[PDB]
Structure 1
Amino acid sequence: PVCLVVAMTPKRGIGINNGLPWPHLTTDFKHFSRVTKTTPASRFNAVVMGRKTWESMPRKFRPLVDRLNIVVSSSLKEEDIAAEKPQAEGQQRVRVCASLPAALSLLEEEYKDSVDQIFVVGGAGLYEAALSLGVASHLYITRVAREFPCDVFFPAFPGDDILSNKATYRPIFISKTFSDNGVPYDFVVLEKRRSSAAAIAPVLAWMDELIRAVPHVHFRGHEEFQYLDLIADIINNGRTMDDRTGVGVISKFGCTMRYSLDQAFPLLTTKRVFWKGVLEELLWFIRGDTNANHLSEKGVKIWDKNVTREFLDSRNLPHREVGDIGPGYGFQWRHFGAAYKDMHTDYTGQGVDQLKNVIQMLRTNPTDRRMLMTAWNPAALDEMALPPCHLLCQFYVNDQKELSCIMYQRSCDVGLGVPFNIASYSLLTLMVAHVCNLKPKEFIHFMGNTHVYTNHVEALKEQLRREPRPFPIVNILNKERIKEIDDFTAEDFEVVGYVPHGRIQMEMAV
């Protein structure tokens, strides 16, 4: 009974020029070491590797310490390796076998009572052989989110859908996303499938009491499970209600999520998120721009259905031009309380610049607890095309110059809006962190009326069948040029290692 351990690009790439495709991934090596070395005493674990894999390792690390080293080869001889370096006391002698079945028989014959767990460590020859023999029970895969140039590949296998879009190997473990040297990765484990509290228990018994996302995944480290469990939760336990749009709603009240920003970026992978949109909208907010046609001209039509002549009239605003959101979001952000006229007016210097206040406070007095920005203006609500959903955000600096952000959202379209909102404010945190010389730490999402529309239910149930991929990294390009929040452009950002599942069509409740 054998276990395989691999690091892999989304296209199954494992190596190039008898070396690793990526820069050093320290956490991955910690992982490789820990899994292969650990045992309950008398016994040790075995690592079976191909000849080139052996030769790819640098001298000082070979043989792998505290593990029996077996090299599958026909050219290399046991004495070749012995002559390579003197065998350290207490360590096992490096054995060589002609094939994998040979290496397994050697383990059975001379190493019973001596070895615990057998690990196939590479390369493509041994991985393919172990899969052909079907002797592999578990796969320890490190999913390198980025694609690199590779000449050697891990073989295709049933269940390789965990890497990229297309007896089975099903994920039973998915971790949160890590990152080393600008490379995002996570860890999955696949499986071959084909009177103490006893007396307390009866009171427990009478007090005690359907849809789950990828139920087989037992360890749910990936931070996207928050969102997937949130959808299930609302469908399971939510209340069917009437709604402004006329479309049905299953709603919940006061839900919550939080996402790390220090390793990777929470751009949801279980469906493709329109990143061009979030970026272009966020920048639009930051200008204090209130013309939806500027977004519409860039291919970002997210506000068009809510700025039509028809919708502006149902809002009792016949004096609004097509594309005028009124003084919402960006306007209150940069010009709180200023008297609105139209989208074409210059409001420079009017009202309160909340964003500039927050940023200056972050830069001088980061322990202040009044670092808040609100879009909710009860005086101007009837002038907006739609009252803001994400209406407030608060900032917080800790011991280690690490920035976190809370955003309150009164109304959350789980299916369509939520993934977008997570990305939009997580980006804002990165931007503010850079400008104030801070490290981004965490985005915290506080949700009011949290709902899925009835016409989304079927699509979301399909989405729950997909296991999340590692999160991407978002890099700020041109860091030296950008010094203020108004310096960011649409070309100052790089999404690296984004490998989502396919787009899912969901109609915007108008």
Structure 2
Amino acid sequence: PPHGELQYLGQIQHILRCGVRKDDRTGTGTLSVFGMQARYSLRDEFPLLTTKRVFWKGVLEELLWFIKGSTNAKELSSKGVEGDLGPVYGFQWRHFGAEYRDMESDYSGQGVDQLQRVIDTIKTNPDDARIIMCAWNPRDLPLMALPPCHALCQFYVVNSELSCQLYQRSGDMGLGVPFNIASYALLTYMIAHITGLKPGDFIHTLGDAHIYLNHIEPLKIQLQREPRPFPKLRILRKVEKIDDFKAEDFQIEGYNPHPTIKMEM
């Protein structure tokens, strides 16, 4: 049974070999392929990539900040990772459809709590095919009426196992993708924990899968590296509500990665 990380490495190689030159909205060049998918088991292991050191603390702290529904940058930097960030992902997760005012405003009971709704739906009908939440790039919101989402997460339950599929309309393969694999795998562990299920698979699906030109050389070196067995993720405490999770509740065990690779943002 091959290491799950071989999928990521195969995809990078495929884009390098077969990808087409295409510019992003900033005009920076990429190599691009449309339509990709990879499946990472969450059963007794956690897919934090090992062919380079992934910044786990940032993954964990950022996700917890999303879950809080915060729109304050300072609330994130203080953890070690003015300040008003607008209706970012967290606000959309917990207060979907609410008119954003101030980051200091009170949004209690305003908008749709997509995150709690996913959890509530898992509890009331685990077979439901509508267990979905979506997020938008904030810049899209005033651009047009009813802009399309940037990403969606669909959840699925069978045999007491929770799976999650993340569809992103575009994915930065060098910098963004490894981080997001960890991030949504972590989210699935949290939701599984809350709903009394065990984690199953995390499936990552992309529209425009691209590599920035300045990431090509570092990525070619990363490809020469053999994956080490994935670590495990332990939740150290019995937790009842998703808002109750804290960074100290989580422990990554046996993470043995290759050295950090810097990719220019």
**TM-score, normalised to structure 2's length?**
0.94
Asked if 2 retains the 8 angstrom alpha-carbon contact of 1:358 and 1:373, the reply is yes
C-alpha distance in 2, partners of 1:442/1:335? 27
Letter in 1 for 2:22: M
Inter-CA distance 277–379: structure 2 relative to 1 (3 Å threshold): closer
Question: Which residue in the other structure is 1:501 paired with?
Answer: 258
State the one-letter code of the partner of 2:166.
M
Are the counterparts in 1 of residues 137 and 149 from structure 2 also a CA contact under 8 Å?
no
Cα 1:270–1:346 shift into 2, 3 Å: same
Paired residues of 1:472 and 1:495 also in contact (CA < 8 A): yes
Match of 2:106 in 1: 346
SS in structure 1 of the partner of residue 4 of structure 2: coil
Q: 1:432 aligns with which of 191, 208, 211?
A: 191
- Looking at structure 2, the residues matched to 286 and 390 of structure 1 have their Cα atoms a distance apart, in angstroms, of 18
Task: State the distance in 2 between where 1:380 and 1:230 align.
Answer: 28
Q: Which residue of 2 is the match for residue 236 of structure 1?
A: 17
- Unaligned 5+ segments in structure 2 are none
Hey, what's the Cα distance between the residues in 1 that align with 2:119 and 2:202?
Answer: 17
Map 1:437-476 to 2 at 5 A: 437-476=196-235
Within a 5 Å distance, the mapping from 1:122-271 to structure 2 comes to: 175=1, 221-271=2-52
Structure 1 residue 363 corresponds to structure 2 residue 118: no
Does residue 477 in structure 1 map to residue 258 in structure 2?
no
Query: By how many angstroms is 1:345 displaced?
Result: 1.5
The amino acid of 2:20's aligned partner reads R
Aligned-pair distance for 1:228? 0.3
Deviation at 1:338? 0.2
Q: 1:279 to 1:239 in 2, by over 3 A?
A: same
Q: Is residue 329–residue 388 contact of structure 1 (8 Å, CA) maintained in 2?
A: no
Change (3 A) 1:483 1:367: same
Q: Distance in 2 between matches of 1:277 and 1:455?
A: 23
1:332 alignment partner, one of 70, 92, 96:
92
Q: Distance in 2 between matches of 1:287 and 1:268?
A: 26
Q: 2:63 aligns with which of 274, 279, 282?
A: 282
Rate the CA distance shift 1:388–1:297 in 2: closer, same or farther, 3 A: farther
1:485: Cα distance to partner? 0.6
In 2: Cα distance, 1:488 partner to 1:390 partner: 26
**Paired position in structure 1 for 2:247:** 490
Secondary structure at the residue paired with 2:202? strand
Equivalent residue number for residue 155 of structure 2: 395
Farther-moved stretch of structure 1 (369-378 vs 249-258): 369-378
CA distance in 1, matches of 2:138, 2:257: 39
Once the two structures are superposed, residues 438-494 of structure 1 have per-residue CA deviations (whole angstroms, 9 ceiling, x without a partner) of 010000111111100000000000000000000000000112xx1011110011000
Distance across 2 between alignment mates of 1:460 and 1:231: 8
Contact preservation (8 Å) 1:265, 1:472 = yes
Structure 1 residues 434 and 447: alpha-carbon distance in aligned structure 2, compared to 1, 3 A threshold: same
Question: Secondary structure at 2:34's aligned position in 1?
Answer: strand
Structure 1 residue 293 displacement after superposition: 2.0
Q: 1 or 2, which has the higher helix percentage?
A: 2
Q: CA deviation at 1:294?
A: 1.6
Other structure's SS at 1:245 match: coil
1:483/1:468 CA distance change after superposition, 3 Å: same
Distance 1:340 1:364 in 2: 30
Contact kept, 8 Å, 2:137 with 2:150, in 1: the verdict is no
CA distance in 2, matches of 1:293, 1:379: 20
Instruction: State the distance in 2 between where 1:282 and 1:265 align.
Output: 16
Alignment partners' CA distance in 2, 1:378 and 1:418:
20
Residue segments in structure 1 that go unaligned for 5+ positions in a row: 1-174, 176-220, 301-321
